[PDB]
Amino acid sequence: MKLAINGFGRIGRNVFKIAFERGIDIVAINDLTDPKTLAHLLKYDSTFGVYNKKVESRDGAIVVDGREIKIIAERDPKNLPWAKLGIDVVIESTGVFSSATSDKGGYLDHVNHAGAKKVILTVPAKDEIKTIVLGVNDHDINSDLKAVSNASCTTNCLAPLAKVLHESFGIEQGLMTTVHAYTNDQRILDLPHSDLRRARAAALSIIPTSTGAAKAVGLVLPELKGKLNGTSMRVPVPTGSIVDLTVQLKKKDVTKEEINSVLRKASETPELKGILGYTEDPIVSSDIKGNSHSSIVDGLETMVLENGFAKILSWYDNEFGYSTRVVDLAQKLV
Amino acid sequence: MKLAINGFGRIGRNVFKIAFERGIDIVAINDLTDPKTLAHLLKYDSTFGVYNKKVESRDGAIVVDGREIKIIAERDPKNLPWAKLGIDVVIESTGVFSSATSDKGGYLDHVNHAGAKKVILTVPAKDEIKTIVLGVNDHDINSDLKAVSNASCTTNCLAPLAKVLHESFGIEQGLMTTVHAYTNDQRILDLPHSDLRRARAAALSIIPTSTGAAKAVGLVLPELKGKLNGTSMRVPVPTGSIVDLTVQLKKKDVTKEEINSVLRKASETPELKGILGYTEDPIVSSDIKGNSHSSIVDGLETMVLENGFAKILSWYDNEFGYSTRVVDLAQKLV
Amino acid sequence: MKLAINGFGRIGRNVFKIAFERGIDIVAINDLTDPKTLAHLLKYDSTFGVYNKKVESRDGAIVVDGREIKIIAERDPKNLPWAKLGIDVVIESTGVFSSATSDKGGYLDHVNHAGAKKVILTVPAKDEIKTIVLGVNDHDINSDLKAVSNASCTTNCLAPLAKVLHESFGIEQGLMTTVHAYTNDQRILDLPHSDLRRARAAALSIIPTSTGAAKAVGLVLPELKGKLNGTSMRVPVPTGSIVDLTVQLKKKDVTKEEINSVLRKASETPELKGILGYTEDPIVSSDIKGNSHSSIVDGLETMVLENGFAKILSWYDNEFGYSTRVVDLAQKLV
Amino acid sequence: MKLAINGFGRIGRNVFKIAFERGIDIVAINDLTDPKTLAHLLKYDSTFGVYNKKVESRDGAIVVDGREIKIIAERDPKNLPWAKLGIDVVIESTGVFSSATSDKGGYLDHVNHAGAKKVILTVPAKDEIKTIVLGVNDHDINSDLKAVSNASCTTNCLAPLAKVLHESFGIEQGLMTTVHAYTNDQRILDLPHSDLRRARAAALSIIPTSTGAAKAVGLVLPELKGKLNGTSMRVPVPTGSIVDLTVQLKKKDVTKEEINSVLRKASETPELKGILGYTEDPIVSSDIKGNSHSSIVDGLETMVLENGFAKILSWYDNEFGYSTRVVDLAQKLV
Ligand SMILES: NC(=O)c1ccc[n+]([C@@H]2O[C@H](COP(=O)([O-])OP(=O)(O)OC[C@H]3O[C@@H](n4cnc5c(N)ncnc54)[C@H](O)[C@@H]3O)[C@@H](O)[C@H]2O)c1
Ligand SMILES: NC(=O)c1ccc[n+]([C@@H]2O[C@H](COP(=O)([O-])OP(=O)(O)OC[C@H]3O[C@@H](n4cnc5c(N)ncnc54)[C@H](O)[C@@H]3O)[C@@H](O)[C@H]2O)c1
Ligand SMILES: NC(=O)c1ccc[n+]([C@@H]2O[C@H](COP(=O)([O-])OP(=O)(O)OC[C@H]3O[C@@H](n4cnc5c(N)ncnc54)[C@H](O)[C@@H]3O)[C@@H](O)[C@H]2O)c1
Ligand SMILES: NC(=O)c1ccc[n+]([C@@H]2O[C@H](COP(=O)([O-])OP(=O)(O)OC[C@H]3O[C@@H](n4cnc5c(N)ncnc54)[C@H](O)[C@@H]3O)[C@@H](O)[C@H]2O)c1
């Protein structure tokens, strides 16, 4: 498989490392800067530490353990040399091309003009697109796909959890909060942003912001369309997040132990192993940094009242779990 | 009225500043250190800034704008000279005397052998104590009371919210999470703690921890006994917290606009003004720092799914709002 | 006088507040966004708190306590209507126009094409310009000036300190470090930046970065040209910084007491009162937040070895002290 | 070698992990808590991640990858069973026994009454003690030593650096600052502390604090006695620190490149390899997290003004580099 990455940022760089480790042929990276900057950011990661490979930069390329990866600095995805380079899958991780096509550009440009076979959009699309969450609607992948969204980090945490709860107990409806690490969409100090909350100094506050992630479960689990909604609180941690899901279940005599038992068992099945995890250790968000699961249920936190009213907490490394899924998905598309 | 403060910490010092500004006669402070240290901590507050008063220290006292306050350093409260000093109300804000008595003392030592007329415990009691949340069960205050708890900051945020929702719509059940500033009960870096989550570096992680604050709503709103529970997430901000309440209401056609409507109305009443606030500004936690309200509904976040299943978010400065309540309560007691 | 602000950022908004309080006629603000965003950022400051004034927005204006300030969104400073509006002084605080002229624009555009009388550049110029540091070279202010740099925050801390030490003891040479709050020039998480140090997650690390602030002392104190250099360390605080100055003095038997005595005396002189402060309180960076001085000597930190080898530490709020100087300077120009 | 650790904290646990990897027999840990808490802290580290070994707790013991280690909970070190357990070297890392003896115990209790053969004090002694900095005064180690201090993390950074500079160029005098991670000696929010600056919320400020680390260089390099002094600034990072050394050298025509060349060359010698490191990458503090060097010169930062007046910066993980030296020292003592 020949991979290209468009947007060598937090997701782009984690995807790179995970894919490189698997022996995938990463042919080219496109961003808006020079090879020296990209090589330096790849080598030294504030969140995850020092990359253990030999990293160099050259004219038009970075070199990783002797493997040379082409660097492009092309703002307009229509202009990318993907056919020339024989690109099988483009990872679209710039954050700025979440419509199919546009005046400034769109994710379908990678396939329709630039000549790549396939594109994975690393964010929910603003329009209609095949959306996959691994462990949830894997079956929806076929060989003829040209464009797929891997949804959001939060949907990837929430959808597997909701799938198991719905299949076991039935969800009538649910509301959620993600208490969520800050990201590069936010601001270091107060500065203009179209979202007036995200305008605010990110390491100084708990910052409410809207999320479509709970509604988006309906795209991958149609039975739950219209049944889930929620909100997000951006807090001052650099990575690591937690979904806090409050559900009304159809099983009106459901207990804490029954909920934890089905979640534990589900995490051990071949369909969800490595995707849904379960723990009973009293951990904190730092403990999940670099964890490849989409969703790790904190069993100690499960809380149940009468009549199927329940709260489930599930951890995820919003960068690393999600990036592993993007690579998992790339390999399945081929 | 003569006030003494036992434990001149985050709560003790805020209570001091609020009471002093009202002209209350603050007779003495007891802690475990010298007057120079207490004067310095009073003068320079990392969270709220420099105290705009002349602060002096001397042998056995501090002086604030020419008013002398005695400093005591007695670890066992049974030994405190409250009768001799004529103390009407002792504020018990050490964090270590949350039982009535023990082989190392308790909050009743203040009103039994030490001889103060009354004690406010600035935390829920580990045993049973008369518990008051202003704006909610003011009627329970009578001149015969000796010992009262002002409950927790979180209960002070939640209970007024619950009161209004219950009176307007009826509350079937609800679950909550507080996304909560770190406190001095936590650890700067990983260090032993009886709570293995609170053992962890407080500025580095989202840290789940149990809370009795939702169940405690039942102490002050007896109709809601058994109907609420929840959890806490401690996050890296030094003050400012938010209650995220997910509630099943009895009014099945309730809308978000209706919910915001009754909360906004309640905020303007004489019973709840100064206690329950309401905003529709897209604020963040740093904006509620130093706000004296117990509970500030974030109107933009209100959300209803189907059939009375609703989500409501409310801000509180866990130090400052709560400390104002402690002073308000002391004044009501006499 | 009629003031305009170009770039309503950290400096721009603080300059606004300080100027407004002085009754200065702030005619217009230019930035890159709408009035609602600008009003919201003025009202709610993560660093400094809630602006206690009635702040409103309308089409092409914000209103503060009933006073209307025009809002413009014009990227090219050549196109600004300063002549039409009668602007006496423009504050150039976008950070992107530090050359007099350029293809994209420069600070002189405000006067030569846009028709304002005078411009203050809120940063060192990349070219030759009149550079003023109040308390250091005030006499260089003449009524015919069209363009002036107020230098940097760090030069404003360092220059008055160097002036006093040089006048009293003589500086042979000096090296310095500023331990400095992060700024909007930095990144919330690792992201491309022309400076590979400033590319890194700003709240996560100590970040060395170059500074010309010590060389720049030579612009306002010619006797110290070529005599000072230094470096910066950006650290995870949102404002508040400290100069750490290590100097070789000409007085070879100079003592800590003598150094502190001249600094304390200088801080009480008409020339430097409100510019250079001196303290002997054991404070930390939070305590200088919102302080209007350019430089506050930490007297307890003064350290002297043999032969005039001395170390002096001086605090500054890099936003607020500097912003106060910008407004002082505006008033001196007219 | 039989090792015991007294004080299983940040240093004690890092020492444990390093020693464990080397096959050192860790016989016993003493602290003030139970085995579950110590096992939990060992397994989950907020700073360094999840420990990749099976960790279990039982009565009076923990087990690490099948190796059993005794857990003791004895406050007074004179009562420790070191003779009975055959302890060769005790690591004294509680932070509360920095005097040889007192009415509450001291470091010599380990070797006098408790009956260990040797004790390493992981801090400068408050009284006189044989002090070793590896890479500097190794020759001072002999078989007759009963009690030694490994000095401080800052002395371990500064001393190897000063050694090379003095050998190559001669040091006349020097002054330094360490910009330094917070530690458990500090406070999460403002709280009493005998050091009024260390009393202040650790993650909210730059906090000046005194240090004997530069003067202590004279203990391990007698030619530099009385020639160095310095101060510390505690800043909001959990680990990772940097020494900023301003030094007057004897070679008056020395250049930045010359300084860097001797430092680079010294870092490759058998005496200093693994102790003194050298880089020319534009790194930040997060990048030295988990680095085992005592001192890593930041070559890009090296600066020379005139006449041998120079500035050198060197990184250190104050926890991990120092803890590696402690283990190195333990092995050299036997
Ligand atoms: N960070 C997370 O936790 C996370 C998780 C899941 C999904 N996502 C999604 O992934 C996407 C990227 O997120 P991120 O956090 O990596 O962002 P980021 O800001 O760290 O990286 C974006 C990168 O794309 C580059 N870029 C911008 N415009 C470009 C263009 N026109 N052409 C080429 N390169 C361009 C930027 O220089 C930058 O390197 C976003 O859509 C985000 O919503 C993020
Ligand atoms: N911080 C908050 O947000 C908050 C809010 C509501 C209630 N509370 C409660 O208020 C109490 C105090 O909390 P805090 O955050 O101010 O704690 P803190 O640790 O900041 O202050 C405790 C103070 O009491 C002193 N002290 C300890 N033992 C003492 C003794 N035996 N005699 C006299 N003084 C002693 C300490 O020296 C310290 O000054 C706790 O019960 C806490 O749960 C805290
Ligand atoms: N923040 C400090 O500590 C500090 C201290 C002294 C000097 N300065 C200097 O002041 C300047 C501003 O710094 P800041 O920290 O306020 O930056 P900031 O990023 O907070 O503000 C910059 C503002 O200018 C606006 N802007 C950008 N391009 C523009 C354009 N073409 N036209 C109109 N507006 C535009 C941005 O939207 C933003 O609102 C910089 O030159 C900086 O070096 C900063
Ligand atoms: N953290 C650093 O960067 C660093 C670097 C070099 C040296 N040091 C020194 O190492 C020592 C330990 O520092 P730390 O940061 O690990 O401290 P820490 O507070 O993390 O750990 C101290 C441990 O000792 C335990 N303890 C306290 N009193 C005890 C007693 N009487 N008996 C048994 N155990 C007791 C505590 O429970 C705790 O687990 C200090 O002397 C410190 O100055 C620290």
- The string of DSSP codes covering B69-110 is EEEE--SSGGG--HHHHT-SEEEE-SSS--SS--TT--GGGG
Q: Are A305 and B236 within 8 A, CB to CB?
A: no
| C-alpha span between C112 and C215 (Å, rounded) | 29
Task: Name every residue whose Cβ is closer than 8 Å to that of residue A16 and which is 6 or more positions away in sequence.
Answer: A5, A8, A26, A29, A42
Q: CA A139 to CA A161: how far, in whole Å?
A: 18
Ligand whose nearest atom lies closest to the CA of C107: 3
What amino acid is encoded at C18 in this protein?
I
Looking at beta carbons, which residues of chain A come within 8 Å of B240? 205-206
Neighbour subunits, C (≥3 Cβ pairs < 8 A)? A, B, D
CA A49, chain centre distance (Å): 20
Instruction: Identify the DSSP state of A170.
Output: -
User: Mind telling me how many Å the CA of B181 is from chain D's nearest CA?
Assistant: 11
B210 vs B188: CA distance, rounded Å: 19
| CA–CA gap between residue D267 and residue B194 (Å, rounded) | 45
Domain boundaries, chain A: 1-151+319-334, 152-318
Q: Is position B13 annotated in a ligand binding site?
A: no
How far, in Å, are A159, A161, B334, D56 from residue A317 at the CA level? 15, 15, 53, 26
Residues of chain C contacting residue D313, judged by C-beta atoms under 8 Å apart: 208, 231
To the nearest whole angstrom, how far is the Cα of B199 from the nearest Cα of chain A?
A: 10
CA–CA distance, B183 with B207 (Å, rounded to integer) = 12
> Taking the mean position of all CA atoms in its chain, how far away is CA C85?
26
Neighbours of C142 (CB within 10 A): 8
- Dihedrals phi, psi of C223, to nearest 5 degrees: -60, -20
Query: With an 8 Å Cβ cutoff, are D283 and A46 in contact?
Result: no
* CA pair distance C210, C227, nearest whole angstrom: 17
Residue of C328, C329, C324 whose CA lies nearest to C288: C324
**Spatial CA neighbour of D12 closest among D285, D330, D287:** D330
Give B1-151+319-334's CATH code, choosing from 3.40.50.720, 3.40.50.920, 3.40.50.2300, 3.40.50.10470.
Answer: 3.40.50.720
SS3 B206: coil
- Could you say which of D50, D281, D289 has the minimum Cβ distance to residue A287? D50
And the tokens for D53? 């070994």
Q: Distance (Å) from the C-alpha of residue B50 to the closest C-alpha of chain C?
A: 6
CA proximity to B311, closest of A314, C172, A177, A239: A177
Quick one: tokens of C19? 């100027």
Nearest CB among D31, D40, D205 relative to B46 is that of D205
Q: Which of D176, D157, B58, B297 is nearest to C246 (CA)?
A: D176
The Cα-based distances of C71 to B217, B290, C2 in angstroms read: 48, 31, 15
Helix (H) or strand (E) holding C303: strand C303-304
Q: What one-character-per-residue DSSP string does C279-298 give?
A: E-S---GGGGTT---SEEEE
Contacts B206 to A, Cβ<8 Å: 179, 235, 237, 240-242, 284-285
Choose the closest CB to A184 out of C32, C188, C238. Answer: C188
Q: Give the residue from A36, A46, A284 with the most D CB atoms within 10 Å of its CB, the best one to mutate.
A: A46
Give D 5-34 residues with CB within 8 A of chain B.
Answer: 9-10, 31-33
- Which of A179, A205, A242 lies nearest to residue B285, judging by beta carbons? A205
CA-nearest of B239, B191, B289 to D189 is B239
* D14 CA → ligand 4 middle, Å: 11
B321 closest CA partner among B284, B274, B285, B267:
B274
In this structure, chain C runs to a length of 334
Resolution, given in Å to one decimal, reads: 2.2
Q: How far apart are CA C73 and CA C71, in angstroms?
A: 7
Task: Please name the residue whose Cα sits nearest to atom 40 of ligand 4.
Answer: D95
Phi first, then psi, for residue B157 (nearest 5°) are -80, -45
Q: How many CB atoms lie within 10 A of CB D86?
A: 14
The per-residue DSSP string of C165-199 comes to HHHHH-EEEEEEEEEEE--TTSBSSS---SSTTTT
Question: Would the CB atoms of C199 and A47 count as touching at under 8 Å?
Answer: no
Cβ neighbours for B297, distance < 8 A, ≥ 6 positions apart: B161, B260, B263, B264, B267, B276, B277, B278, B279, B312, B313, B314, B315
- DSSP letter for D34, please: -
D46, D93, D180, best to mutate vs chain B, most B CBs in 10 Å: D46
C152-318 has the same fold as C1-151+319-334:
no
Q: For chain D, percent helix, then strand, then coil, each to nearest 5?
A: 25, 30, 45
The residues facing D201 across adjacent strands are D187
Of all protein residues, the one whose alpha carbon is nearest to atom 40 of ligand 3 is: C95
| Degrees to nearest 5, angle at CA D103 with D105 and B34 | 110
Our CA angle for C298, C300, C303, nearest 5°, is 95
**∠ Cα C247 C250 C252 (to 5°):** 95
Burial B87-107 (b: 16+ CB within 10 A, else e): bbbbbbbbbebbbbeeeebbb
Which residues of chain C have a CB within 8 Å of the CB of B46? 284, 286-287
CA distance C297 to chain A (A): 27
Closest CA to C302 of C271, C265, C333, C258: C258
- Do residues A259 and A274 make contact, with C-beta atoms less than 8 angstroms apart? no
Residue ranges at the known binding site of C: 10-11, 31, 75, 122, 152-154, 183-184, 198, 211-212, 234, 318
In angstroms, what is the span from residue A184 Cα to ligand 3's centroid?
19
Taking alpha carbons only, the member of B123, B300, B322 closest to residue B239 is B322
Point out the ligand nearest to the CA of residue D47.
4
Q: What are phi and psi of A261, to 5 degrees?
A: -65, -50
Measure the CA–CA gap between C231 and C208, rounded to whole angstroms: 7
Give me ligand 2 centre to Cα D323, in Å.
34
CB A116 within 8 A of CB A82: yes
- If you search the block for the tokens 């945490």, which residue do you land on? A157
The residue among C123, C101, C102 whose CA lies nearest residue C183 is C123
Superfamily the domain A152-318 falls into: Dihydrodipicolinate Reductase; domain 2 (3.30.360.10)
| A173 contact residues in B (CB cutoff 8 A) | 305-307, 309
Cα–Cα distances (Å) from B117 to A164, B3, B8, B255, in that order, read 58, 10, 20, 48
Pocket of ligand 2 (CB under 6 A): B 6-12, 30-32, 75, 93-96, 122-123, 152-153, 183-184, 318-319, 322; D 191-192
Binding-site residues of A, please?
10-11, 31, 75, 122, 152-154, 183-184, 198, 211-212, 234, 318
Residue B302 known to bind ligand? no
Cα separation of D235 and D204, whole Å?
8
How far is Cα C296 from Cα C135, in angstroms, rounded to an integer? 13
| Residue whose entry in the numeric block shows the structure tokens 């006349």 | D172
Q: Are A96 and A107 in contact (CB under 8 A)?
A: no
Interacting residues of D122 by C-beta distance below 8 A, sequence separation 6+: D11, D15, D91, D92, D93, D149, D150, D322, D326
Residue B57 three-state SS: strand
For A47, the closest chain D residue by CA position comes to: D286
CB C30 within 8 A of CB C7: yes
Find the angle CA(C228)-CA(C234)-CA(C236) to the nearest 5 degrees. Answer: 150
Q: What is the C-alpha to C-alpha distance for residues C127 and C104, in angstroms, rounded to an integer?
A: 16
Q: What is the number of other CB atoms lying within 10 angstroms of the CB of residue D326? A: 25
Tell whether ligand 3 has an atom less than 6 A from the beta carbon of residue C238. no
Catalytic residue among B153, B176, B217, B304: B153
> What gap in Å lies between CA A163 and CA A223, rounded to an integer?
10
Inter-CA distances, A142 with A136, B197, B216, C117, Å: 15, 44, 53, 68
Residue for token pair 């570096």: B201
Q: Which residues of D touch A286 (CB under 8 A)?
A: 46, 49
Pick from A294, A301, A296, A261: nearest CA to A277: A296
Rounded to a whole number of angstroms, the distance from the CA of A292 to the nearest CA of chain D is 14
Helices marked H in B124-246 — which ranges? 153-169, 217-220
Interface contact flag, A303 B230, Cβ < 8 Å? yes
Q: Do the Cβ atoms of C203 and C209 come closer than 8 Å?
A: no
| Those residues with Cβ within 8 angstroms of residue B144's Cβ, 6 or more apart along the chain or in another chain | none
How many CB atoms neighbour CB A59 within 10 A?
7
Ligand 2 closest atom vs CA B13: 16
Element (H, E) at D158: helix D153-169
B259 alpha carbon – ligand 1 mean position (Å): 37
C-alpha to C-alpha distance for A301 and A260, rounded to whole angstroms: 10
Report the first-to-last Cα separation within chain D, whole angstroms.
7
Helix A256-267 with A153-169: angle, nearest 10 deg = 120
Question: Interior CA angle at C216 toward C212 and C221, to 5°?
Answer: 160
Best substitution site from B93, B102, B156 to test ligand 2's pocket, by max atoms within 8 Å of Cβ?
Answer: B93
Of D32, D203, D236, Cβ closest to residue B192: D32
Question: Is B198 annotated to bind ligand?
Answer: yes
Nearest Cα residue to atom 14 of ligand 3: C10
C209 to chain D, minimum CA–CA distance in Å?
9
Which atom of ligand 3 approaches the CA of C185 most closely?
19
Of C32, C198, C289, the one to substitute when testing ligand 3's pocket (max ligand atoms within 8 A of C-beta) is: C32
Q: How was this structure determined?
A: X-ray
Residue nearest to atom 21 of ligand 2 (CA): B9
Give contacts of A 75-114 with B, CB under 8 A.
Answer: none
Which candidate from C49, C284, C290 shows the least CB-CB separation from B289? C49
